[PDB]
Amino acid sequence: MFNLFLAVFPEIFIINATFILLIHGVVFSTSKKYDYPPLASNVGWLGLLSVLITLLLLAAGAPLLTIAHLFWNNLFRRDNFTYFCQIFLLLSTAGTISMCFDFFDQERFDAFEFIVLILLSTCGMLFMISAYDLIAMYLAIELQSLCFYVIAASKRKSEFSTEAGLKYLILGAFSSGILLFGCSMIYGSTGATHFDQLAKILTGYEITGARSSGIFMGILFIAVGFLFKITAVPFHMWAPDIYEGSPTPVTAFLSIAPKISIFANILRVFIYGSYGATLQQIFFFCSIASMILGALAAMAQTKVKRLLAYSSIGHVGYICIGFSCGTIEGIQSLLIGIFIYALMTMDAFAIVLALRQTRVKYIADLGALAKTNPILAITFSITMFSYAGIPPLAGFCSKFYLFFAALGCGAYFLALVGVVTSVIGCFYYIRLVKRMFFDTPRTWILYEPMDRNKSLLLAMTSFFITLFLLYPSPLFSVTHQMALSLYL
Amino acid sequence: GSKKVSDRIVKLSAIDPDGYKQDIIGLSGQTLLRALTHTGLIDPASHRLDDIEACSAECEVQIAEEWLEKLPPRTYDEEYVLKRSSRSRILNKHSRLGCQVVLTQELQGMVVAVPEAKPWDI
Amino acid sequence: YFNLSGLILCPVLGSIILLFIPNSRIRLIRLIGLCASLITFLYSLVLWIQFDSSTAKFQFVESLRWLPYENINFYLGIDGISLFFVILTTFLIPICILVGWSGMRSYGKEYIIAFLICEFLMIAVFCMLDLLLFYVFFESVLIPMFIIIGVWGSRQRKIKAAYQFFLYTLLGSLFMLLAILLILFQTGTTDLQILLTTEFSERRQIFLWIAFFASFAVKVPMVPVHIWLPEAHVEAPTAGSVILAGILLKFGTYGFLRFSIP
Amino acid sequence: MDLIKYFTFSMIIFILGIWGILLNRRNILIMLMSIELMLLAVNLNFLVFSVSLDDMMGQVFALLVLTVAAAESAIGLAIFVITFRVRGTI
Amino acid sequence: PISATMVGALLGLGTQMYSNALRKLPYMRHPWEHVVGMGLGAVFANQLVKWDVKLKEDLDVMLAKARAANERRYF
Amino acid sequence: DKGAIEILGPYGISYTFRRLAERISQ
Ligand SMILES: CCCCCCCCCCC(CCCCCCCCCC)(CO[C@H]1O[C@@H](CO)[C@H](O[C@@H]2O[C@@H](CO)[C@H](O)[C@@H](O)[C@@H]2O)[C@@H](O)[C@@H]1O)CO[C@H]1O[C@@H](CO)[C@H](O[C@@H]2O[C@@H](CO)[C@H](O)[C@@H](O)[C@@H]2O)[C@@H](O)[C@H]1O
Ligand SMILES: CCCCCCCCCCCCCCCCCCCC(=O)O[C@H](COC(=O)CCCCCCCCCCCCCC)COP(=O)(O)OCCN
Ligand SMILES: [Fe+3]
Question: How many independent structural domains does chain D possess?
């Protein structure tokens, strides 16, 4: 009986480690001997250690992920796609935890429950990727949504943080209601909630005889809810406001982690929910609109975080290009784009957090950065060019292969929109590089040097971005392996 | 004689929101926001840069009706920045931008009313 | 045995060495940059000597895997057409270094480093036999030249000229990239030796030719897009103009000779 | 015909919840009670479908969604409480 | 030739000195962690190559299975 | 050059994106 739980040690470990960290923090924060120590950095380091140990548990136990698959069949399904998605998710969480260490000291964020809630959200997303049922997917989505609602309003005294948390909670609850109504309408029309059953019942009757109103409506509502979750327009109701008002270490996590898991869910819904290519049209329109709106909205931004939010929306549209073209080479392009975008976003948010110790708010603030810190300016310019998609950098490979996938299915209209949006994006990305190097402001802002964690993260990510084209084979190999394993 | 700092000292009357009138000192050739920063009426950490694009009307001031004719007219950028941050999308018709008002020796005794503070941390 | 690998790695080592040298040692930076440029030029001259002039096959071929299924890979080779372009693009760099000798105390290491990266990226352009990677190194030159035009410009106009050059180059680049993608999907590979032995349908030849012409005509200004060249030429350092006039204007002609015409 | 009536009632409840979220954008409390109305409508859908199809996968889900609805209520009301304190108004 | 050990060592030394530069410190601030970074880079490069080979083998196996599944449609 | 080629070019009239990007607040 104990060996049936060999498939859930990575989750059991992280759950128990979160419990131990919570007990440790609550016991020793409210202590008289140690004069109420602000043990946020301690809990952060121990949580990073826990993440690394559960990464070791999950990665090493690769043959054991299919163990007791019949017993766990109704609960979750673990396969090669889940394995790599979960490993990438743990890596991103560890990177975010590493970045947010300096936030706890200079700004004096002494609340240790931030790390505990991050770990609980990580557990929710681990259960999300392997979820093979509507019920499990909904529960994991709600768990991570609550863990994010709580930490979005962590800055209680801040006007922006409270409003951002309120807007985030309202939007997320509305999206969850729409998704949940879609799930109810699907369950009431087919009588099944498991993905295997829901694939066997829908794969044959491909609207050949008539269009099932209930099934079509449920599919549409689930798609709409998921589109709210990833903030693809016109379902970006308050996403820029949430990104701006949220704390920067918090904004770093929501910009990366909630996207990997939700995209995994959308893929595991496409494996069965391809009902008459209905989602392919919805994602087609959503991707075009997302690229256009992100490109046309990030040029009218003077703040760094709003520009990052609109960049995230544009890259979500670029990724949804892969959804619109349903093929192995489309899903592979989608996953490569997700990986590259996550790494670039981690790079950019580490750079922003490095300058956040001096309260950077506007693009003009980073005006004379090429004179005071002439290597941080180079790193930020590299990240901006990678966002733009300049050929020599790693950001070009994702857009290249996504455009190739789009042209494979024969959608020539998507390619033209992507090209125009790429031109606009490159313009407003090199606009930032103009400020750092070419302008000569009268007043300069001097920043204090960053710490070791963010310096190492920036160095590694910048070496990845510039030198990815030389050795891109492993990423393509693992991505092609994941895309094929979605069905066999 | 010689070049004195007092030769470019602009005397101003700044009223903080609770109706107290205190006399601030500025330099002719620098922005009125800089003059307000010297005493501490406006937090220097909120408007560290005297630039239009690095501004969200954190330097908004209320110039007197008779003291507004001796100033350059508001530019398009100034109006655009003023409207968005008004929280009501309305124009006060007597509110200027601190970073866009350059002090001059003809502005001796200009009465300026500083509105209430607004959040700027993030 | 002198091959194309060493000729490309010499500027790489030259740029890496200067990357980690203190800026106070101005003499050492100039000496090492000039020595690297001269060594690269001598390497090119030696490559000329061992060049067979009786075979149409590409010589000194080198391969390095790029995609996991060897669909597209780093294929480097020279022929009687691109040999002199490589020699010229390695000869011009030491002259560019020597131009800014007196004033180098103000530019710093980022000047010679930018020129060495330029040389590394332009040697690979004339040596690539893969259509896609020829585009990758074709439009990687923008970043070093963008930095050269903007950081070390003459007047405040340097921002406008850089924007115009970059925007025109992007407009050509992506419209050519779409054609490259269409060729890759249909043919199956992007190798020049395979693309030169594939019978393209008559209808697709005009569209692909126009798309290739869009990117190449910008870099060899015909008539309607010759308005960026004068501004970029005037708003550039003395050595920067040599690169734009000596090499960057030879990309369009070489692109027409190598890909479009066959 | 009773399944039609049971579905129509819950559809109207869902529409009312969406209206309350949309119409009452000025007030925050209505924007929470409307979400709770939507959750109630969906739970009613799941229970009615479970009874109609003679399947227990709707009742388990209704019980598990009650927890999510309650936790959303708790977090939303805490966020509203801290929101009123800072800006002094709704 | 260019082995994974030497490129890994160079990348590790480069990232250590890049981290030192990003913090406004001298390049060779702590000499021991430069050696540590060289070792870690060599190990990571060797592991990356070893993983890439196995990854390609597994991709080949999966693609063979997919092609076999597709080929049965003609019966 | 300075006329039709510039007005129909990238900045004579293609700078309407300033009158187009700023409207995205709607
Ligand atoms: C970003 C820097 C850019 C540098 C790349 C350009 C420089 C060129 C050197 C690239 C380099 C290192 C990769 C560096 C990783 C980057 C660092 C990551 C971060 C570190 C901080 C890989 O390059 C080779 O790797 C081969 C993979 O084996 C691939 O060949 C393809 O494989 C097939 C697949 O199955 C394809 O089907 C097929 O088409 C190709 O044959 C090719 O990728 C390439 O030939 C050098 O090769 C190194 O790996 C292997 C040789 O293989 C050597 O040892 C091997 O070990 C066993 C095999 O496990 C073998 O049993 C053993 O016999 C062998 O001795 C090493 O001594 C060294 O030579
Ligand atoms: C990929 C392209 C190729 C790139 C090159 C790769 C080369 C291989 C890696 C080479 C690394 C060389 C680093 C030299 C070793 C120095 C390590 C010393 C760190 C240390 O002593 O611990 C304390 C900080 O911990 C730390 O600094 C730990 C920081 C770890 C940050 C990331 C943690 C793992 C996250 C998962 C990966 C990242 C995301 C990937 C998706 C130092 O303390 P102190 O004295 O400095 O003062 C308090 C600052 N806190
Ligand atoms: Fe201002």
Answer: 1
Q: What is the edge-to-edge ordering of all strands in the sheet holding B60-63?
A: B21-27, B9-15, B110-113, B60-63, B95-97
SS (H, E, C) C53-89: CCCCCCEEEEEEECCCCCCCEEEEEECCCCHHHHHHH
Strand partners, C73: C65
Tokens of C91: 């000869």
Distance, CA of A58 to chain centre:
20
Place of tokens 């999300």: A128
Cβ(E44) – ligand 2 distance below 6 Å: yes
Domain region containing D12: 2-87
What is the three-class DSSP state of C133?
helix
Chain C residues within 8 Å of chain F (Cβ atoms): 164, 167-168, 224, 227
Rounded to whole angstroms, how far apart are CA atoms F15 and F11?
5
Q: Is A303 helix (H, G, I), strand (E, B) or coil?
A: strand
Q: Which two tokens stand for residue A143?
A: 């768990």
Q: Does D3 touch chain A (CB under 8 A)?
A: no
Q: Which strand (E) or helix (H) includes residue A416?
A: helix A412-437
- Say how many CB pairs under 8 Å bridge A and C: 78
CATH number for the domain harbouring residue D61:
1.10.287.3510
Point out the residue among E17, E27, E56 whose CB comes nearest to the CB of C68: E56
CB contact under 8 A, A177 and D38: yes
Beta bridge partners of A279: none
CA-based nearest residue in chain C for residue A418: C174
Judge contact between B110 and B64, C-beta under 8 A: yes
> CB of A237 within 8 Å of any CB in chain F?
no
User: C153 to chain A: which residues are within 8 Å by CB?
Assistant: 438
Q: Which residues contact A302 (CB under 8 A, 6 or more apart)?
A: A362, A363, A364, B53, B54
Across the strands, what pairs with B60?
A: B97
**B59 annotated to bind ligand:** yes
Q: What is the resolution in angstroms?
A: 3.1
Q: Which residues of D43-66 are buried (b: 16+ CB within 10 A; e: fewer)?
A: bbbbbbbbeebeeebbeebbeebe
The experimental method is cryo-EM
Rounded CA separation A241/C251 (Å): 46
**φ/ψ of residue C73, rounded to 5:** -150, 160
Q: Mapped to the 3 state alphabet, what secondary structure does D5-57 carry?
A: HHHHHHHHHHHHHHHHHHHCCCCHHHHHHHHHHHHHHHHHHHHHHHHHHCCCC
Bond prior to A234 in cis (omega within 30° of 0): yes
